[PDB]
Design a protein around this ligand. Structure first.
Ligand SMILES: [Mg+2]
Lengths: 458, 457
């Protein structure tokens, strides 16, 4: 009957992202259908309600059930759901969005926006532009891209290669050539006894060593999230970005700021770049761009790169780059309504204020908890990393599944917080509309779940 | 105000497939599209056009379907988004998956994985082909054979699959592992070859390439049933059977790229059914939603799916996902789109009116002195312009014959595309088009072709 037939269809015909193919198909990993939501709460097919303390995947930033955004999508869909943006074609919506992103949200020196539908396709565009940039400048060898261990930049062949987490590489023959990875800037896991400043110098020196080992004239760009998202909610050490940028300047290497997660208020600033004083040449956005109301990505191109793009076109004609759905009208309309709401409600300010409250409440609650090795985060991102031996920084045996168990316990108590991959880490990325009262409720549920698992394993 | 919009556009919008400097300087003037209904669109000057290219082979049910807008709206109100990670779903994405497999895909297809573009779908394809071979213990079996003039997307990997040089130049493509065999365009065959000899030539050259590379190193072959962006090129009679026999011999997977051909465009469910192809993997987008929302699909056959299951048992969950995979509003748009394709029998209209289009273009242009070839099938057609018909000598590209014909059509209120890398006028109208509308398109094309013929002949 109805729901049972839907789950049967799901098992038989729907290949999910990031889902154990056989267990899901067999029914051992049970399906869940989401039927609605409002604010920070979602509802499933059994009528159970959950506090979504992960905002989908760091993306439902204005919260669920915004009929204002639905209306805007509808209006555009009625007027003109689609035409292409090839050979200088546009809608009013995509033009207004481009101007608004550059004028109101992007850091200084940014000029143009190129649109796709995912964070992954945006980073794909980024590498194409970096390679084109160097070819038109007469530097055919200057092509390598430096990423970082535990960075997350997407799930394709090139983009999965940028990504620094092994599950995105396994059985896909990644990373492909030209992509290198430097160190994860996680001070908690630094060589023992290193101060924060020593650790920063270590990260800068290791970057330099890698650049010199590869040949600086062969290295084109460096890509990094301001704060690492999927690699575990890892804020950089104090002074990290200034030290990295001095190395990149020395060897004439472009900085790509991956703002897929950090963009559009998530850290309590416009983007992560402004938050940390980064000066990127190229910026990747998605997620909070539309609050996931529709799929849209952006590549924000600085003046320096844009100027060379123009020159390339003068010498060689139009660049061979386009997606059919680049600048999709309904997606642009969703973004505009999303920005209106972020601005009108000052959700960047709410993220800074309530986010700091979240940071503080998690430190007070879990700072001395025997299961918790580190409490970390910034703005509206936070995490608890679970360790078997706190003082030595000895992780649990992965087979124990401490992280997933904490997450599952939260879920039983009606709260969604993610077991982050490749470690034992509980992650929080709530919608930016969250209140202090809602934070207290999330923290209390997390506390119970962490206590419960601590009893089982300690 | 219109001037202010264009100033914003020039200053801040990087378009796809647009001369960056000329557009920024104003030398390539912008165009804003404000509306459309049926086969007709409207621009910022209030000028109206017959869109004989359906956007980019994609607005298949026609413009202004408030039924689809309503469906998008309803889903957006109820739940615009949640992820589909770790077995999560909406009812819409489940219904869509079952409907694609049961009603549209060829026999033997089992699962659908969702993205947002034809390009990201082909990216997924290569991941699956590599994963498939690694889990089977064949780490060398990884090369992908594509074809000259094939179009498969505009990324690094997908642009490498693509066989048109504009998608490669200054991007260092194609990357390693990607090879290209011959374009199956009989009109441009080695001189004297009959149609059957040309098919044998294509099969033999494929086999030679496979043997030169080492068959044990070749994982897949990717092909559009009919080549779209490479010039509206239907395959020769018997081509697909001959190619498939070579693929079967060396145990090579067939990826049918149905981004254009899918969902009624040729007068069949997909190009695969039309030509009797037996793919292991299928790529869809465009006509999946009629572009009302961005959605792509990878349709996975039983054979590949079974290995995917086994891989998960041995190695855990596959590391593949996009944030927006299975996006609810996009799924709702597809469902409404399918309802309309089915209810109005647009596959049947595409077969019937498409045959009329084929016939009318051959009668009108078969002996035209500018036209070297008239080709097409179903609701795809093209005219290729040549300087010397019997010798098959193209015009000097600098003459811009194709673009000039297209521009002349446009002046007379019809959009038909000057296809890249040659002098080719392309047609891919919405599937709702009538015979009377076909006559009008052909008449405008006739005038435009005559006008340019006067200038250059
Ligand atoms: Mg060998």
């Amino acid at each position: 009957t109805d729901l049972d037939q839907l789950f049967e269809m799901d098992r038989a015909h729907f290949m999910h992202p990031s889902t154990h193919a056989h267990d899901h198909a067999s029914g051992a990993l049970p399906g869940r259908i989401i039927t609605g939501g409002k604010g920070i709460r979602i509802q499933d097919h059994e009528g159970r309600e959950y506090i979504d303390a992960f905002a989908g995947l760091y993306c439902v930033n204005i919260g669920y059930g915004r009929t204002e955004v639905a209306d805007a999508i509808y209006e555009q869909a009625k007027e003109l759901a689609y035409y292409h943006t090839y050979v200088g074609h546009s809608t009013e919506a995509i033009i207004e969005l481009s101007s608004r992103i550059i004028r109101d949200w992007a850091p200084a020196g940014m000029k143009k926006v190129y649109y796709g539908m995912s964070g992954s396709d945006a980073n794909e565009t980024q590498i194409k532009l970096v390679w084109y940039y160097n070819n038109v400048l007469g530097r055919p060898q200057k092509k390598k891209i430096i990423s970082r261990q535990r960075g997350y930049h997407g799930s394709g062949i090139m983009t999965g290669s940028l990504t620094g987490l092994p599950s995105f590489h396994q059985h896909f023959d990644l990373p492909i050539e030209r992509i290198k990875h430097t160190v994860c800037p996680h001070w908690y896991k630094a060589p023992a006894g290193m101060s924060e400043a020593q650790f920063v110098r270590y990260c800068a020196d290791e970057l330099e060593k890698l650049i010199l080992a590869e040949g600086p004239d062969t290295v084109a760009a460096f890509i990094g999230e301001p704060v690492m998202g999927t690699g575990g909610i890892i804020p950089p050490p104090q002074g990290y970005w200034e030290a990295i940028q001095a190395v990149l300047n020395k060897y004439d290497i472009l900085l790509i700021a991956d703002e897929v997660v950090c963009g559009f208020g998530r850290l309590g600033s416009k983007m992560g770049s402004q938050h940390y004083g980064m000066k990127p040449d190229l910026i990747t956005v998605a997620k909070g761009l539309t609050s996931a109301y529709a799929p849209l990505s952006g590549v924000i191109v600085g003046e320096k790169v844009w100027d060379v793009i123009e020159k390339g076109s003068q010498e060689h004609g139009p660049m061979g780059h386009g997606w059919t759905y680049s600048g999709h009208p309904i997606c642009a309309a969703a973004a505009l309504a999303n920005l209106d709401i972020l601005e009108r409600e000052n959700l960047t300010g709410n993220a800074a204020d309530v986010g700091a409250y979240l940071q503080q409440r998690l430190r007070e609650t879990f700072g001395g908890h025997p299961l918790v090795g580190e409490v970390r985060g910034v703005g509206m991102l936070a995490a608890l990393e679970f360790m078997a031996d706190k003082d030595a920084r000895t992780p649990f045996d992965p087979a124990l599944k401490v992280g997933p168990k904490v997450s599952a316990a939260c879920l039983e108590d009606g709260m969604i917080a993610r077991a982050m991959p490749h470690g034992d880490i509980l992650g929080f990325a709530p919608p930016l509309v969250i209140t202090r009262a809602e934070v207290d409720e999330i923290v209390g549920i997390a506390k119970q779940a962490v206590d419960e698992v601590a009893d089982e394993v300690l």
